[PDB]
DNA sequence: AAAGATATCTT
DNA sequence: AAAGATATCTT
């Protein structure tokens, strides 16, 4: 299906290719940075080609925002299935150490998700699904990176800002915490777990209703949260509550 | 001077320069996409080396962030003298057409302008300059082409996302404006202004004191500062009155 | 944890 | 304009 060729070649291209520079016409080649500002655009960039070249081989259109604050990365859709849109996200996050846990910013909670048609590319009712695609990459030891230029010739001369990197594609609701991803700018946070557990998709909400009705309730501070629900278990009291 | 050849190699290698894509050292390129996000971290990785190559030239050690978050993106200063140390931030905004009015976002006005130590890699106090380095572009719509990979011997070929690109080196108190560059993100406003104005240096603050006093009490919404000031001339006739 | 940093945009 | 979106991190 387009999701497993999706996968398969998302963990191909990046067991093959180590991005390690920005390229200008005249060949000269920038080192990358170590902070995760460069690596989500460098991984964003990276994904563009691999999503369209899958995307075509299904008949399926692939569209980027036009405004800048504007989700989903990659709206994908066949133009006789208007309605049956699916919505890709490219998210980046690191550990210091292989087997550290990690965890995501999933998006805001107080757009699209409680607003049909606020900061999306088309109304939030016309997506059926809502894929993300992780990359998680350990950085070097090395707080050191470098400052001079290369050419061509060099390109196994230069030092890449991160010693691995993983990838793997779930839905957002799959792997959805109880707990917001950030503050001012209330994002939905990922449940706070290993590479595996993405991957398998062991989450904590029982449906994806279930995740949204979660997310569309959620209070922005702990003070107004405190009457209502802080996590899971909260929540489904509150349910039982009679939603009071 | 340290800041005239900065900005004539900036201006320089701006000119000779277009940076087109990302390589891997396998020699595969991938198109740049048409958004700040993604420009804003490819002019930082430009700049690196030229800031480096000219402040070696005048004797300066180059610091970047050990941290994330950490304001600036580069720390300059003699060995000789650790106190009196110049701050260096690339900011990058997108025109529609040449010639239009554009502003830049000039940092927190509630991190290390208020707590010396806040967010910043050296005590506030330790930086006798902060120095700006904006970019300015003229955004191009993302053709078909841009979704494919490219191989070294199509350099040439690969469309690019800007249709030009100013730069320009100013002290960041000089071009700052009176109003918020955000929200909810707390950010310091620049004057909304023609690129010329921004390289003559034609602002609104009389000294850099003045600057520091009016962003250290600015208050965070319109509802708190209708009683205080909300521009340059509110503050004047607030401080005329003896902050009152 | 929760709250508020990092950079920049849109209406 | 002011206020709140876009992605992610740190304390």
């Given at each position: 299906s387009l999701r497993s060729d999706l996968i398969n070649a998302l963990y191909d291209e990046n067991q093959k290719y180590d991005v390690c520079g920005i390229i200008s016409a005249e060949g000269k080649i920038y080192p990358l940075g170590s902070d995760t500002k460069v690596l989500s655009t460098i991984f964003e960039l990276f994904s563009r080609?691999?999503?369209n070249k899958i995307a075509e081989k299904h008949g399926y259109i692939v569209e980027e925002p036009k405004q800048q604050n504007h989700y989903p990365d990659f709206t994908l859709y066949k133009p006789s299935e208007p309605n049956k849109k699916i919505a890709i996200?490219?998210?980046?996050t690191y550990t210091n150490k292989e087997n550290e846990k990690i965890?995501?910013?999933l998006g805001g909670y107080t757009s699209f998700i409680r607003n049909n048609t606020?900061?999306?590319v088309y109304p939030?009712?016309?997506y059926i699904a809502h894929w993300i695609i992780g990359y998680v990459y350990t950085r070097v030891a090395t707080r050191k990176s470098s400052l001079k230029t290369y050419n061509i010739n060099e390109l196994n001369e230069i030092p890449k800002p991160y010693k691995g990197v993983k990838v793997f594609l779930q839905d957002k609701w799959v792997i959805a915490?109880?707990?917001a991803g950030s503050g001012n700018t209330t994002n939905i946070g990922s449940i706070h777990a290993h590479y595996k557990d993405f991957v398998?998709?062991?989450g904590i909400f029982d449906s994806e209703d279930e995740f949204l009705d979660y997310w569309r309730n959620y209070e922005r501070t702990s003070q107004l949260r405190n009457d209502k629900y802080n996590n899971?278990?909260?929540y489904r009291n509150w349910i039982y509550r009679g939603r009071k």
């Amino acid at each position: 299906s387009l999701r497993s060729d999706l996968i398969n070649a998302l963990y191909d291209e990046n067991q093959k290719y180590d991005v390690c520079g920005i390229i200008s016409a005249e060949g000269k080649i920038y080192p990358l940075g170590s902070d995760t500002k460069v690596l989500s655009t460098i991984f964003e960039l990276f994904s563009r080609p691999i999503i369209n070249k899958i995307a075509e081989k299904h008949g399926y259109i692939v569209e980027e925002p036009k405004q800048q604050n504007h989700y989903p990365d990659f709206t994908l859709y066949k133009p006789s299935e208007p309605n049956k849109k699916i919505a890709i996200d490219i998210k980046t996050t690191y550990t210091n150490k292989e087997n550290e846990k990690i965890k995501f910013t999933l998006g805001g909670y107080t757009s699209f998700i409680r607003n049909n048609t606020k900061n999306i590319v088309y109304p939030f009712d016309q997506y059926i699904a809502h894929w993300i695609i992780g990359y998680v990459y350990t950085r070097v030891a090395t707080r050191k990176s470098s400052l001079k230029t290369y050419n061509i010739n060099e390109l196994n001369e230069i030092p890449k800002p991160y010693k691995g990197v993983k990838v793997f594609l779930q839905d957002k609701w799959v792997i959805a915490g109880d707990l917001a991803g950030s503050g001012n700018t209330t994002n939905i946070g990922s449940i706070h777990a290993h590479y595996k557990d993405f991957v398998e998709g062991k989450g904590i909400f029982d449906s994806e209703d279930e995740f949204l009705d979660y997310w569309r309730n959620y209070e922005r501070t702990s003070q107004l949260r405190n009457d209502k629900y802080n996590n899971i278990s909260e929540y489904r009291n509150w349910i039982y509550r009679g939603r009071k």
